[PDB]
Amino acid sequence: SMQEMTLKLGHLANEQNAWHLAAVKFGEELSTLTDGRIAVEVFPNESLGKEIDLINGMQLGTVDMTITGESLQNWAPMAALLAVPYAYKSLEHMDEVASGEIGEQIKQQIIEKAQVRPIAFFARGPRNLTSQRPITSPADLDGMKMRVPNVPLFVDVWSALGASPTPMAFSEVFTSLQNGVIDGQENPLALIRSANFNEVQGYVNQTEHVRSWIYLTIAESTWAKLSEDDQNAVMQAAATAQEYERGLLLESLAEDRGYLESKGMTFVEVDGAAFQAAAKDAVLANVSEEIRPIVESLFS
Ligand SMILES: O=C(O)[C@@H](O)[C@H](O)[C@H](O)[C@@H](O)CO
Numbered sequence: 001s002m003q004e005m006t007l008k009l010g011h012l013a014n015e016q017n018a019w020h021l022a023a024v025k026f027g028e029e030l031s032t033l034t035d036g037r038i039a040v041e042v043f044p045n046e047s048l049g050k051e052i053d054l055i056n057g058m059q060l061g062t063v064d065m066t067i068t069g070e071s072l073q074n075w076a077p078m079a080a081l082l083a084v085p086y087a088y089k090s091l092e093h094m095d096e097v098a099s100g101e102i103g104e105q106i107k108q109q110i111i112e113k114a115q116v117r118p119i120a121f122f123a124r125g126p127r128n129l130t131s132q133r134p135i136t137s138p139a140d141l142d143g144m145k146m147r148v149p150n151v152p153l154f155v156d157v158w159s160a161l162g163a164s165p166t167p168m169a170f171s172e173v174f175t176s177l178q179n180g181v182i183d184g185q186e187n188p189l190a191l192i193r194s195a196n197f198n199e200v201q202g203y204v205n206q207t208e209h210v211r212s213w214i215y216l217t218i219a220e221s222t223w224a225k226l227s228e229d230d231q232n233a234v235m236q237a238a239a240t241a242q243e244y245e246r247g248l249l250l251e252s253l254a255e256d257r258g259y260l261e262s263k264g265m266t267f268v269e270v271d272g273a274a275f276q277a278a279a280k281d282a283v284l285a286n287v288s289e290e291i292r293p294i295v296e297s298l299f300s
Pocket of ligand 1: 012051068069070071072148149150151169170186187188191214
């Protein structure tokens with residue numbers, strides 16, 4: 001019948017990735033719940049903009065929604081908790097933190113300081129280091145040029161480990177690897193697959209150095225314009241999408257390694273104790289005083 005608005009939702013994954021399917025599901029549910037009054041247009045592959053630019057757009061009023069997580073720490077320091085290296089043990093552990101009082105504090109700081117509102121969270125598989133030569137311990141890095149996202153803690157940690165990390169938008173990584181500007185990057189297997197990093201990297205080093213969650217978010221200025229009933233619909237759609245996305249994540253854990261191996265990637269076992277010890281030291285040396293007690297608790 002009537003269509004009152006169309007929310008633009010951007011993310012960095014491709015159309016087979018769990019996040020995309022979840023974003024589509026969110027849109028379907030929200031449309032149903034609002035009798036078509038609120039439509040969602042999904043923009044994959046950073047086609048709406050790079051992550052940092054979408055966050056700025058949400059603040060300025062030009063972007064409605066995105067999938068974003070620890071890059072929010074550039075505005076809300078507590079958001080670094082989404083992705084502390086070696087902190088979270090499992091999906092269940094992360095669900096507890098993200099859904100508990102610590103998670104509520106993180107949510108409120110993101111709203112206040114970044115002017116974006118998390119409405120759902122998606123747990124992720126572990127990040128792994130990819131490279132052109134095997135990397136079995138920190139000693140192997142030897143100044144290796146690598147990409148990290150726009151996440152200050154990741155710059156701190158990877159520098160301390162012995163690499164030379166440069167922050168870059170996700171959609172620029174493939175060409176940067178292809179052109180030899182950087183030699184490696186780090187991400188969960190689902191995103192290595194999504195971005196076809198198998199075409200420009202030889203090795204997946206199983207560092208498993210970060211287990212993290214990420215948020216589906218709506219601009220606080222968009223949220224503010226919605227009626228209470230429509231806010232409720234957004235939350236309900238988001239909850240449905242979250243349950244759906246978890247299933248897709250679990251499916252991907254069964255298949256993504258095999259797929260990447262079929263595309264020629266070699267998986268490398270690492271000296272986990274060495275990586276863990278060195279990374280935890282670097283985290284503690286660089287963590288904001290604001291979240292230090294929580295990190296010390298997680299590391300205990
Ligand atoms: O490497 C990336 O860019 C992605 O894994 C995510 O965007 C990253 O985890 C953070 O920027 C999420 O805010």
